[PDB]
Ligand SMILES: CC(/C=C/C(=O)NO)=C\[C@H](C)C(=O)c1ccc(N(C)C)cc1
Ligand SMILES: [K+]
């Protein structure tokens with residue numbers, strides 16, 4: 001029978017901001033999501049995967065030992081040193097429990113990828129924090145210490161074969177700069193991100209997120225950026241991006257495992273995204289990805305700051321993984337012109353690499 005795995009560990013709530021108790025990357029993000037899965041009776045339908053700590057050797061699959069050593073050292077720091085260290089990065093706060101929580105987020109995901117790859121479960125959801133996709137090989141960034149999704153892709157290959165094909169779909173409203181960079185020269189890991197860009201004025205504020213960054217060397221064509229410009233986007237724009245880009249490229253790539261860097265900050269009500277993707281929209285995207293890799297899909301929480309929006313959106317993704325009927329959504333709504341421009345720009349930049357793509 002198809003089983004859905006779920007991993008959650010309340011110890012990941014220990015990572016906190018001691019200088020701003022209302023910082024948006026709240027410990028309550030994961031507990032509210034977990035409680036909503038209980039209320040909707042989704043949790044009881046899942047196989048509970050145990051959380052674990054990632055080892056330093058596993059962190060070294062993507063990160064430098066210098067970076068690992070510095071984050072590890074924060075476990076023993078006084079508040080004044082935690083404040084100073086956090087200030088060395090772009091948008092990071094650290095507590096003595098941060099390192100442990102980042103290890104738990106990655107270890108939880110490794111156990112989930114292992115459960116899927118060994119056939120213990122068909123697919124899985126990881127309700128983890130702190131997030132990972134902005135973390136680079138050598139630095140923490142944007143609430144992220146280690147790149148959980150990137151590490152999970154490498155971990156998956158370490159327990160199978162180096163050439164295991166992993167698709168990472170990053171639907172967090174922000175560009176996963178760390179994920180792109182880690183796999184930029186790699187043809188074994190296809191990275192597809194959709195993200196608010198605003199001509200480089202939206203976090204992480206780099207032209208690296210533009211559609212013309214297609215990958216390097218043997219990785220040329222294996223990096224797909226779908227940047228949004230022109231304000232609020234929603235379900236029609238995301239469905240069109242999946243229809244014309246994400247799914248044709250994914251099918252041509254033929255992944256053996258699908259990781260979703262599932263931020264829910266493109267959700268309706270999120271003040272850090274300003275977008276309108278609905279829980280039914282996220283459900284549709286999850287169900288489309290389930291048609292890939294024999295259903296081998298692991299959904300990894302990234303960002304998403306409206307407690308109610310993320311709890312509803314992520315629960316709807318789990319509902320899809322469990323085999324519930326997908327929402328009836330169509331492609332009849334006209335897109336905002338700027339979203340058409342964005343999709344056409346990606347189609348043009350990726351036409352050389354992916355024969356199945358349409359011109360416009
Ligand atoms: C890091 C983050 C979201 C992360 C996330 O959700 N990861 O996916 C949001 C922060 C508040 C932000 O908006 C910001 C904007 C500009 C900036 N500069 C120009 C230095 C620094 C930070
Ligand atoms: K993204």
Ligand SMILES: [K+]
Nearest residue numbers: 183186189222
């Ligand atoms: K790549």
Ligand SMILES: [Zn+2]
Nearest residue numbers: 172174265303
């Ligand atoms: Zn985000």
